[PDB]
Short mmCIF file of C-alpha atoms and ligand atoms in Angstrom, two decimals:
data_model
loop_
_atom_site.label_atom_id
_atom_site.label_comp_id
_atom_site.label_asym_id
_atom_site.label_seq_id
_atom_site.Cartn_x
_atom_site.Cartn_y
_atom_site.Cartn_z
CA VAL A 1 0.00 0.00 0.00
CA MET A 2 1.26 3.50 -0.64
CA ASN A 3 3.78 4.44 2.02
CA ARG A 4 2.81 1.30 3.96
CA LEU A 5 0.11 3.40 5.62
CA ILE A 6 -3.64 2.63 5.76
CA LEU A 7 -6.01 5.25 7.15
CA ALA A 8 -8.65 3.98 9.58
CA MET A 9 -11.51 6.35 8.77
CA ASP A 10 -13.69 6.05 11.90
CA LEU A 11 -15.17 9.54 11.90
CA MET A 12 -18.98 9.21 11.94
CA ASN A 13 -19.95 12.19 9.80
CA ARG A 14 -19.66 12.05 6.01
CA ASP A 15 -18.49 15.66 5.71
CA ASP A 16 -15.69 15.23 8.24
CA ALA A 17 -14.73 11.80 6.82
CA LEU A 18 -14.48 13.20 3.28
CA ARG A 19 -12.47 16.23 4.44
CA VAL A 20 -9.86 14.25 6.37
CA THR A 21 -9.54 11.55 3.70
CA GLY A 22 -9.09 14.18 0.98
CA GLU A 23 -6.44 15.97 3.04
CA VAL A 24 -4.34 12.84 3.46
CA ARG A 25 -4.94 11.15 0.10
CA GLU A 26 -1.55 12.13 -1.28
CA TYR A 27 0.04 9.94 1.46
CA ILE A 28 -2.06 6.74 1.20
CA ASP A 29 -3.56 4.37 -1.35
CA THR A 30 -5.81 2.43 1.01
CA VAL A 31 -8.62 3.42 3.42
CA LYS A 32 -10.10 1.08 6.03
CA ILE A 33 -13.81 1.86 6.58
CA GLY A 34 -15.62 0.26 9.50
CA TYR A 35 -19.01 0.20 11.12
CA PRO A 36 -18.66 3.60 12.86
CA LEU A 37 -18.83 5.32 9.44
CA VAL A 38 -21.03 2.78 7.62
CA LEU A 39 -23.71 2.57 10.32
CA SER A 40 -23.79 6.37 10.42
CA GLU A 41 -23.81 7.21 6.71
CA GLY A 42 -24.72 4.00 4.85
CA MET A 43 -23.00 1.40 2.69
CA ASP A 44 -23.02 3.81 -0.25
CA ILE A 45 -20.11 5.60 1.47
CA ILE A 46 -17.81 2.79 0.32
CA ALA A 47 -18.43 3.42 -3.42
CA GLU A 48 -18.31 7.16 -2.85
CA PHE A 49 -14.87 6.91 -1.27
CA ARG A 50 -13.56 4.51 -3.89
CA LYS A 51 -14.69 6.85 -6.70
CA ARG A 52 -13.74 10.20 -5.17
CA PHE A 53 -10.33 9.17 -3.90
CA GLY A 54 -9.53 6.28 -6.21
CA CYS A 55 -8.32 4.40 -3.09
CA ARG A 56 -8.70 0.72 -2.31
CA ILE A 57 -11.22 0.11 0.49
CA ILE A 58 -10.91 -2.49 3.23
CA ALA A 59 -14.29 -3.05 4.99
CA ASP A 60 -13.41 -3.57 8.58
CA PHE A 61 -16.48 -5.42 9.68
CA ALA A 62 -14.71 -7.85 12.10
CA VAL A 63 -17.04 -10.46 10.71
CA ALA A 64 -17.85 -12.89 13.51
CA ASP A 65 -21.01 -14.90 12.84
CA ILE A 66 -22.07 -18.38 11.74
CA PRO A 67 -21.15 -19.44 8.23
CA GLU A 68 -24.50 -18.69 6.58
CA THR A 69 -24.63 -15.20 8.06
CA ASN A 70 -21.01 -14.50 7.28
CA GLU A 71 -21.80 -15.36 3.64
CA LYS A 72 -24.59 -12.80 3.56
CA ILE A 73 -22.41 -10.13 5.19
CA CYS A 74 -19.59 -10.66 2.67
CA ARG A 75 -21.94 -10.63 -0.30
CA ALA A 76 -23.46 -7.34 0.80
CA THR A 77 -20.04 -5.90 1.51
CA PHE A 78 -18.55 -6.72 -1.85
CA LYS A 79 -21.72 -5.67 -3.66
CA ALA A 80 -21.11 -2.27 -2.05
CA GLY A 81 -17.70 -2.14 -3.73
CA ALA A 82 -15.27 -3.03 -0.95
CA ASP A 83 -11.96 -4.55 -2.10
CA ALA A 84 -11.45 -6.69 0.99
CA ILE A 85 -13.14 -7.53 4.27
CA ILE A 86 -11.71 -8.14 7.76
CA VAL A 87 -12.93 -11.41 9.30
CA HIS A 88 -12.43 -12.77 12.84
CA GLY A 89 -10.75 -16.16 13.15
CA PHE A 90 -12.10 -16.91 16.65
CA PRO A 91 -15.46 -18.29 15.36
CA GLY A 92 -13.53 -21.11 13.65
CA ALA A 93 -12.75 -22.56 10.25
CA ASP A 94 -16.22 -22.91 8.78
CA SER A 95 -17.04 -19.23 9.51
CA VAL A 96 -13.78 -18.19 7.85
CA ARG A 97 -14.26 -20.53 4.84
CA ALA A 98 -17.69 -19.05 4.20
CA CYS A 99 -16.03 -15.62 3.80
CA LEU A 100 -13.29 -17.07 1.59
CA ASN A 101 -15.92 -18.68 -0.63
CA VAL A 102 -17.75 -15.43 -1.25
CA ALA A 103 -14.42 -13.62 -1.86
CA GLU A 104 -13.49 -16.26 -4.43
CA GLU A 105 -16.90 -15.86 -6.04
CA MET A 106 -16.62 -12.12 -6.32
CA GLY A 107 -12.92 -11.67 -7.01
CA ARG A 108 -12.00 -10.02 -3.69
CA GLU A 109 -9.93 -10.66 -0.56
CA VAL A 110 -10.33 -11.69 3.06
CA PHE A 111 -8.07 -10.40 5.84
CA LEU A 112 -8.02 -12.70 8.88
CA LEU A 113 -7.93 -10.94 12.27
CA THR A 114 -5.75 -13.18 14.46
CA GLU A 115 -4.95 -11.32 17.72
CA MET A 116 -6.48 -7.97 18.69
CA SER A 117 -4.59 -4.93 19.91
CA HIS A 118 -6.51 -3.79 23.01
CA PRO A 119 -5.86 -4.92 26.62
CA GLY A 120 -8.89 -7.22 26.72
CA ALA A 121 -7.39 -9.33 23.90
CA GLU A 122 -5.21 -10.91 26.57
CA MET A 123 -8.19 -12.63 28.18
CA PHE A 124 -9.26 -15.13 25.49
CA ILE A 125 -7.98 -14.17 22.05
CA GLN A 126 -4.25 -14.19 22.73
CA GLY A 127 -4.25 -17.78 23.97
CA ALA A 128 -5.92 -18.91 20.73
CA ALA A 129 -4.16 -16.56 18.35
CA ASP A 130 -1.31 -18.81 17.21
CA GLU A 131 -3.82 -21.52 16.38
CA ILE A 132 -6.10 -19.05 14.64
CA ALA A 133 -3.18 -18.03 12.47
CA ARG A 134 -2.27 -21.66 11.71
CA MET A 135 -5.91 -22.27 10.79
CA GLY A 136 -5.62 -19.33 8.39
CA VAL A 137 -2.58 -20.86 6.73
CA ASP A 138 -4.37 -24.19 6.42
CA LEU A 139 -7.37 -22.50 4.75
CA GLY A 140 -5.14 -20.66 2.28
CA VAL A 141 -5.66 -17.20 3.81
CA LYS A 142 -2.96 -14.84 2.54
CA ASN A 143 -3.87 -11.56 4.30
CA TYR A 144 -3.76 -11.11 8.09
CA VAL A 145 -4.21 -8.52 10.83
CA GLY A 146 -2.25 -8.52 14.09
CA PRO A 147 -1.47 -6.11 16.91
CA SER A 148 0.97 -3.15 16.83
CA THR A 149 0.68 -2.99 20.62
CA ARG A 150 2.48 -6.35 20.97
CA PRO A 151 5.32 -6.56 18.49
CA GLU A 152 6.54 -9.83 20.02
CA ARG A 153 3.10 -11.30 19.18
CA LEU A 154 3.30 -9.67 15.75
CA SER A 155 6.68 -11.39 15.25
CA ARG A 156 5.25 -14.76 16.24
CA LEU A 157 2.31 -14.20 13.81
CA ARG A 158 4.70 -13.36 10.98
CA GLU A 159 6.58 -16.52 11.87
CA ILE A 160 3.45 -18.63 11.41
CA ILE A 161 2.14 -17.00 8.24
CA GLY A 162 5.44 -16.73 6.44
CA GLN A 163 7.16 -13.94 4.54
CA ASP A 164 4.86 -14.04 1.53
CA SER A 165 1.58 -13.43 3.37
CA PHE A 166 0.44 -9.79 3.69
CA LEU A 167 0.13 -8.53 7.30
CA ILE A 168 -1.40 -5.24 8.38
CA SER A 169 -1.40 -3.91 11.89
CA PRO A 170 -3.59 -1.52 13.93
CA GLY A 171 -2.86 0.01 17.35
CA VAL A 172 -0.26 2.52 16.13
CA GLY A 173 -0.31 5.91 17.87
CA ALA A 174 -3.40 6.23 20.06
CA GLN A 175 -3.19 2.68 21.42
CA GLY A 176 0.54 2.97 22.02
CA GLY A 177 2.07 1.18 19.03
CA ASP A 178 5.08 2.50 17.15
CA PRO A 179 5.25 2.81 13.35
CA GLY A 180 8.84 1.70 12.84
CA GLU A 181 8.78 -1.24 15.25
CA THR A 182 5.50 -2.52 13.86
CA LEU A 183 6.85 -2.34 10.32
CA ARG A 184 9.67 -4.71 11.32
CA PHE A 185 6.97 -7.42 11.05
CA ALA A 186 3.88 -5.97 9.32
CA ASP A 187 3.76 -4.90 5.67
CA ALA A 188 1.58 -1.94 6.50
CA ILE A 189 0.30 -0.09 9.54
CA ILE A 190 -3.27 1.06 10.14
CA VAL A 191 -3.58 4.51 11.74
CA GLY A 192 -6.84 6.17 12.78
CA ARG A 193 -7.03 8.72 15.57
CA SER A 194 -3.35 9.88 15.43
CA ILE A 195 -4.31 11.17 11.95
CA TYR A 196 -8.06 11.91 11.96
CA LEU A 197 -8.19 13.66 15.34
CA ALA A 198 -5.03 15.69 14.66
CA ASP A 199 -5.27 19.47 14.25
CA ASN A 200 -3.57 18.89 10.86
CA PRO A 201 -4.16 15.34 9.54
CA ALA A 202 -1.92 15.86 6.50
CA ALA A 203 0.95 16.90 8.82
CA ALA A 204 0.32 13.91 11.10
CA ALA A 205 0.32 11.50 8.12
CA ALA A 206 3.44 13.13 6.68
CA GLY A 207 5.18 12.87 10.06
CA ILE A 208 4.41 9.16 10.21
CA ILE A 209 5.57 8.64 6.60
CA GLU A 210 8.81 10.48 7.33
CA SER A 211 9.58 8.18 10.26
CA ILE A 212 8.66 5.22 7.95
CA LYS A 213 10.95 6.21 5.04
CA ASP A 214 13.77 6.15 7.60
CA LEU A 215 13.45 2.39 8.10
CA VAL B 1 -41.04 -12.05 24.65
CA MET B 2 -44.37 -12.97 23.12
CA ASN B 3 -44.63 -16.73 22.83
CA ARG B 4 -40.93 -16.99 23.76
CA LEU B 5 -40.18 -16.66 20.05
CA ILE B 6 -37.86 -14.10 18.40
CA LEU B 7 -37.77 -13.87 14.61
CA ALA B 8 -34.31 -13.63 13.04
CA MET B 9 -35.09 -11.45 10.02
CA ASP B 10 -32.10 -12.17 7.75
CA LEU B 11 -33.79 -11.68 4.40
CA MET B 12 -31.81 -9.07 2.44
CA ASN B 13 -34.63 -7.32 0.58
CA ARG B 14 -36.84 -4.77 2.35
CA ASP B 15 -40.00 -5.89 0.55
CA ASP B 16 -39.53 -9.55 1.47
CA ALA B 17 -38.45 -8.68 5.04
CA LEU B 18 -41.55 -6.51 5.58
CA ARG B 19 -43.86 -9.17 4.10
CA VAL B 20 -42.60 -12.03 6.25
CA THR B 21 -42.44 -9.93 9.43
CA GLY B 22 -45.99 -8.68 8.87
CA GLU B 23 -47.23 -12.23 8.30
CA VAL B 24 -45.82 -13.49 11.58
CA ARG B 25 -46.32 -10.42 13.78
CA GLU B 26 -49.32 -11.89 15.57
CA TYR B 27 -46.99 -14.61 16.97
CA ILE B 28 -44.00 -12.52 18.16
CA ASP B 29 -43.17 -9.31 20.01
CA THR B 30 -39.47 -9.18 19.17
CA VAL B 31 -37.48 -9.15 15.90
CA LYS B 32 -33.71 -9.65 15.70
CA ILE B 33 -32.24 -7.65 12.79
CA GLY B 34 -28.65 -8.27 11.74
CA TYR B 35 -26.14 -7.12 9.20
CA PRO B 36 -27.62 -9.11 6.28
CA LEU B 37 -30.66 -6.80 6.30
CA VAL B 38 -28.98 -3.62 7.58
CA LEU B 39 -26.07 -3.70 5.12
CA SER B 40 -28.56 -4.28 2.32
CA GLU B 41 -31.26 -1.73 3.16
CA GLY B 42 -29.72 0.70 5.68
CA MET B 43 -29.97 1.47 9.38
CA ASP B 44 -33.29 3.23 8.81
CA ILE B 45 -34.85 -0.25 8.51
CA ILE B 46 -34.64 -0.57 12.31
CA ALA B 47 -36.94 2.44 12.98
CA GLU B 48 -39.20 1.39 10.14
CA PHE B 49 -39.70 -2.05 11.66
CA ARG B 50 -40.17 -0.70 15.17
CA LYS B 51 -42.86 1.74 13.95
CA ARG B 52 -44.69 -0.50 11.50
CA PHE B 53 -44.82 -3.58 13.69
CA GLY B 54 -44.54 -2.04 17.14
CA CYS B 55 -42.02 -4.82 17.94
CA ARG B 56 -38.89 -4.58 20.06
CA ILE B 57 -35.73 -4.78 17.94
CA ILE B 58 -32.52 -6.57 18.89
CA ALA B 59 -29.59 -5.45 16.67
CA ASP B 60 -27.58 -8.55 16.12
CA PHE B 61 -24.29 -6.96 15.26
CA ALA B 62 -22.06 -9.55 17.06
CA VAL B 63 -20.01 -6.57 18.14
CA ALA B 64 -16.38 -7.67 18.31
CA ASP B 65 -13.96 -4.74 18.20
CA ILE B 66 -11.74 -2.71 20.53
CA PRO B 67 -13.45 -0.66 23.21
CA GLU B 68 -13.39 2.69 21.40
CA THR B 69 -14.85 1.20 18.23
CA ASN B 70 -17.42 -0.81 20.12
CA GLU B 71 -18.56 2.47 21.73
CA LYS B 72 -19.08 4.05 18.32
CA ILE B 73 -20.96 0.99 17.01
CA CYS B 74 -23.33 0.96 20.00
CA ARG B 75 -23.99 4.68 19.81
CA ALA B 76 -24.89 4.44 16.14
CA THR B 77 -27.03 1.39 16.78
CA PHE B 78 -29.08 2.91 19.57
CA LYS B 79 -29.38 6.21 17.70
CA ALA B 80 -31.05 4.13 14.98
CA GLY B 81 -33.66 2.99 17.50
CA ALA B 82 -32.57 -0.52 18.44
CA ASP B 83 -33.71 -1.73 21.88
CA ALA B 84 -30.70 -3.97 22.49
CA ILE B 85 -27.48 -5.05 20.83
CA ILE B 86 -25.72 -8.43 20.70
CA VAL B 87 -22.05 -8.22 21.74
CA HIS B 88 -19.32 -10.89 21.60
CA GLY B 89 -17.60 -11.75 24.88
CA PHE B 90 -14.47 -13.24 23.26
CA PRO B 91 -12.74 -9.81 22.83
CA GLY B 92 -12.68 -9.48 26.63
CA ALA B 93 -14.00 -7.36 29.47
CA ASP B 94 -13.02 -3.90 28.31
CA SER B 95 -14.73 -4.40 24.91
CA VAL B 96 -17.88 -5.59 26.69
CA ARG B 97 -17.80 -2.76 29.29
CA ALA B 98 -17.60 -0.19 26.51
CA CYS B 99 -20.93 -1.53 25.15
CA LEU B 100 -22.45 -1.60 28.64
CA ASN B 101 -21.43 2.02 29.17
CA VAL B 102 -23.17 3.23 26.03
CA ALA B 103 -26.27 1.13 26.88
CA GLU B 104 -26.37 2.73 30.33
CA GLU B 105 -26.02 6.15 28.72
CA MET B 106 -28.84 5.60 26.31
CA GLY B 107 -31.23 3.51 28.38
CA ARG B 108 -30.87 0.26 26.42
CA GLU B 109 -29.58 -3.30 26.82
CA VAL B 110 -26.63 -5.47 25.90
CA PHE B 111 -26.93 -9.19 25.17
CA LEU B 112 -23.65 -11.07 25.65
CA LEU B 113 -22.94 -13.82 23.09
CA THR B 114 -21.16 -16.54 25.09
CA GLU B 115 -20.92 -19.70 22.92
CA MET B 116 -21.95 -19.85 19.26
CA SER B 117 -24.18 -22.47 17.68
CA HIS B 118 -22.29 -23.56 14.54
CA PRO B 119 -19.75 -26.42 14.29
CA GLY B 120 -16.75 -24.09 14.17
CA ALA B 121 -17.62 -22.77 17.66
CA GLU B 122 -16.00 -25.94 18.98
CA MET B 123 -12.55 -24.81 17.87
CA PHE B 124 -11.90 -21.78 20.11
CA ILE B 125 -15.11 -20.32 21.52
CA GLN B 126 -16.41 -23.34 23.40
CA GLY B 127 -13.25 -23.70 25.49
CA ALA B 128 -13.58 -20.07 26.63
CA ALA B 129 -17.35 -19.91 26.89
CA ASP B 130 -17.77 -20.69 30.58
CA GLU B 131 -15.25 -17.99 31.42
CA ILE B 132 -16.89 -15.56 29.03
CA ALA B 133 -20.16 -16.14 30.83
CA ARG B 134 -18.55 -15.67 34.25
CA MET B 135 -17.00 -12.44 32.97
CA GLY B 136 -20.51 -11.36 31.97
CA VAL B 137 -21.81 -12.01 35.47
CA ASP B 138 -18.91 -10.07 36.96
CA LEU B 139 -19.65 -7.09 34.68
CA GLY B 140 -23.33 -7.11 35.62
CA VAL B 141 -24.57 -8.37 32.24
CA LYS B 142 -28.13 -9.64 32.59
CA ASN B 143 -28.95 -10.78 29.03
CA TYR B 144 -27.12 -13.63 27.26
CA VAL B 145 -27.11 -15.68 24.06
CA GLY B 146 -26.14 -19.35 23.91
CA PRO B 147 -26.52 -22.27 21.50
CA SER B 148 -29.68 -24.31 20.81
CA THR B 149 -27.49 -26.85 19.03
CA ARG B 150 -25.82 -27.83 22.34
CA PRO B 151 -28.40 -27.96 25.10
CA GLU B 152 -25.84 -29.40 27.54
CA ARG B 153 -23.76 -26.24 26.95
CA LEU B 154 -26.93 -24.15 27.25
CA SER B 155 -27.59 -25.84 30.62
CA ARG B 156 -24.07 -25.07 31.83
CA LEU B 157 -24.51 -21.41 30.70
CA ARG B 158 -27.79 -21.13 32.59
CA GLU B 159 -25.99 -22.58 35.58
CA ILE B 160 -23.39 -19.80 35.48
CA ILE B 161 -25.72 -16.88 34.81
CA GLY B 162 -28.44 -17.87 37.23
CA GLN B 163 -32.22 -18.10 36.96
CA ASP B 164 -32.82 -14.37 36.90
CA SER B 165 -30.69 -13.54 33.86
CA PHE B 166 -32.46 -13.53 30.47
CA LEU B 167 -31.11 -16.10 27.96
CA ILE B 168 -32.03 -16.32 24.29
CA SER B 169 -30.92 -19.04 21.95
CA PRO B 170 -30.38 -19.37 18.17
CA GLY B 171 -29.79 -22.55 16.14
CA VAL B 172 -33.39 -23.82 16.32
CA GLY B 173 -34.67 -25.54 13.17
CA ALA B 174 -32.22 -25.05 10.30
CA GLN B 175 -29.12 -25.64 12.43
CA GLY B 176 -30.68 -28.65 14.12
CA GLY B 177 -31.87 -27.29 17.47
CA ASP B 178 -35.22 -28.18 18.99
CA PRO B 179 -37.69 -25.61 20.37
CA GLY B 180 -38.86 -27.53 23.43
CA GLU B 181 -35.45 -28.78 24.55
CA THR B 182 -33.88 -25.35 24.14
CA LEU B 183 -36.64 -23.76 26.18
CA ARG B 184 -35.75 -26.05 29.10
CA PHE B 185 -32.82 -23.61 29.60
CA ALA B 186 -33.40 -20.48 27.47
CA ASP B 187 -36.17 -17.94 28.08
CA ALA B 188 -36.71 -17.49 24.37
CA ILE B 189 -35.65 -19.08 21.11
CA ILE B 190 -34.45 -17.25 18.01
CA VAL B 191 -35.74 -18.71 14.72
CA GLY B 192 -34.79 -17.49 11.25
CA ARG B 193 -34.84 -19.73 8.21
CA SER B 194 -37.39 -22.31 9.54
CA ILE B 195 -39.82 -19.35 9.44
CA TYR B 196 -38.61 -16.92 6.76
CA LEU B 197 -37.81 -19.52 4.09
CA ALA B 198 -41.01 -21.48 4.71
CA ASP B 199 -43.72 -21.59 2.03
CA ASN B 200 -46.04 -20.23 4.75
CA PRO B 201 -44.12 -18.34 7.49
CA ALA B 202 -47.24 -17.77 9.60
CA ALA B 203 -47.92 -21.54 9.58
CA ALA B 204 -44.29 -22.30 10.47
CA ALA B 205 -44.36 -19.81 13.37
CA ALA B 206 -47.71 -21.14 14.56
CA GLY B 207 -46.39 -24.71 14.41
CA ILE B 208 -43.43 -23.74 16.57
CA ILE B 209 -45.68 -21.86 19.04
CA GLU B 210 -47.99 -24.87 19.29
CA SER B 211 -45.09 -27.14 20.23
CA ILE B 212 -43.98 -24.42 22.73
CA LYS B 213 -47.36 -24.05 24.49
CA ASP B 214 -47.14 -27.79 25.13
CA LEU B 215 -44.14 -27.37 27.45
C1 LIG C 301 -11.60 -5.48 13.98
O1 LIG C 301 -10.98 -4.42 13.24
C2 LIG C 301 -9.63 -3.93 13.26
O2 LIG C 301 -9.05 -3.71 12.20
C3 LIG C 301 -8.98 -3.64 14.58
C4 LIG C 301 -8.57 -4.79 15.26
C5 LIG C 301 -7.73 -4.62 16.35
O3 LIG C 301 -7.29 -5.59 16.99
N1 LIG C 301 -7.43 -3.35 16.72
C6 LIG C 301 -7.89 -2.28 16.07
O4 LIG C 301 -7.57 -1.16 16.49
N2 LIG C 301 -8.67 -2.41 15.00
C7 LIG C 301 -9.23 -1.24 14.29
O5 LIG C 301 -8.21 -0.41 13.77
C8 LIG C 301 -8.51 0.99 14.01
C9 LIG C 301 -7.48 1.50 15.01
O6 LIG C 301 -7.61 2.94 14.99
P1 LIG C 301 -6.78 3.89 15.96
O7 LIG C 301 -5.48 4.16 15.24
O8 LIG C 301 -6.59 3.21 17.29
O9 LIG C 301 -7.65 5.14 16.13
C10 LIG C 301 -9.91 1.04 14.54
O10 LIG C 301 -10.80 1.07 13.41
C11 LIG C 301 -10.01 -0.31 15.22
O11 LIG C 301 -11.39 -0.68 15.36
C1 LIG C 302 -24.01 -13.36 16.40
O1 LIG C 302 -25.44 -13.41 16.29
C2 LIG C 302 -26.37 -14.42 16.70
O2 LIG C 302 -27.39 -14.09 17.30
C3 LIG C 302 -26.11 -15.85 16.35
C4 LIG C 302 -25.13 -16.45 17.14
C5 LIG C 302 -25.00 -17.82 17.06
O3 LIG C 302 -24.17 -18.45 17.76
N1 LIG C 302 -25.78 -18.48 16.18
C6 LIG C 302 -26.68 -17.86 15.40
O4 LIG C 302 -27.35 -18.56 14.62
N2 LIG C 302 -26.85 -16.55 15.47
C7 LIG C 302 -27.80 -15.83 14.59
O5 LIG C 302 -29.13 -16.27 14.79
C8 LIG C 302 -29.80 -16.45 13.52
C9 LIG C 302 -30.04 -17.95 13.35
O6 LIG C 302 -30.97 -18.05 12.25
P1 LIG C 302 -31.45 -19.46 11.66
O7 LIG C 302 -32.63 -19.87 12.50
O8 LIG C 302 -30.31 -20.44 11.73
O9 LIG C 302 -31.80 -19.18 10.20
C10 LIG C 302 -28.89 -15.89 12.47
O10 LIG C 302 -29.15 -14.48 12.38
C11 LIG C 302 -27.54 -16.11 13.11
O11 LIG C 302 -26.59 -15.21 12.53
#
């Protein structure tokens, strides 16, 4: 992705979301749009972003249901123009395969969320995360998400998925993660608040990119 | 809930969703609306259903993100008029507390999803489910979701949450669960396809209710 930086656009107002995305577009080629924006402004926001900004869109819907429902969610998500969807691994292999099937049908991609970045992830997810990743490999998943806040866990993930798989990582900035350290293991970092709540989002993005180019 | 039966309205077309819900409204007082319908027709469908049918609405959004994102999701969901939201316990206590905080702010309810009903739940969720339920109790959660497909697990859940907590249960019909057995432990059953794919949804709902009244 351009500059190895993905914007997490979690503002919940279309006008503000368009403004910030437009201001930082020169520094990214990929925007992650989640439920905060979609449930506030509608699924049509995905196609609007893709057209206006010409950026790839990852639908961060943390998909976590039974297989039949996951199918429906993916179909709706790709019909709305998303390039990829983020799917939880914790519900198990059938739930993940359902998403992979729809992606194969519609020519898109699944990202498997393996271990989450917040403190509560330590309770249940972390203990399963290596296995979730190994399940991903066994299902042929090639794209993964793991936590900037725990680079030792992000290293272990990379170890499981191999060098060829694509790994993106949230928790940089607001949650405490560091861009450079995270990029030792991830291919790209996801950044939301450190950019979209900044007084000058373009300056914040540029500052991050400048510390990235130094790698 | 009326007749202890909650309709899972996972049709993805507003016209079909309105037709089936209207046909079965005499037999229910509560409709669960999930992402299949919302991502297809928009969040405004929640208020439309609540007004047209006068039914309570549970937003089944299987909320499974970090605390700050979960907050945003709940706020948007209640702003759209939902009476309650379904939240995953697997992301841990902070993610769940974030949802409880918004519910307390806005005068609504959280249902905690503890163990899922599909085969893949056996891989990771089942091994954590007792703890997830105990975490719920410790956070003051009063409403829970557990699996019709495993009544022995549904019994163990009930055992943890106590007699006073409210427990609803999907996986009845299509997934193999039985109404009467599930209602030995759950307060209400969730039913989707067995009703909404039936040639006569009113007849299917009535058939279920008739086997329920016999308890
Ligand atoms: C489930 O979706 C994610 O991509 C996600 C997983 C995770 O473990 N941590 C995490 O922060 N995210 C998302 O990534 C974004 C992080 O944004 P932030 O930089 O903290 O403001 C935000 O959209 C989160 O919901
Ligand atoms: C996460 O949301 C749920 O309520 C859910 C959890 C679960 O473990 N099993 C489960 O079936 N559900 C939902 O309940 C509905 C079941 O519908 P069905 O009767 O199988 O057609 C459908 O909306 C599922 O997504």
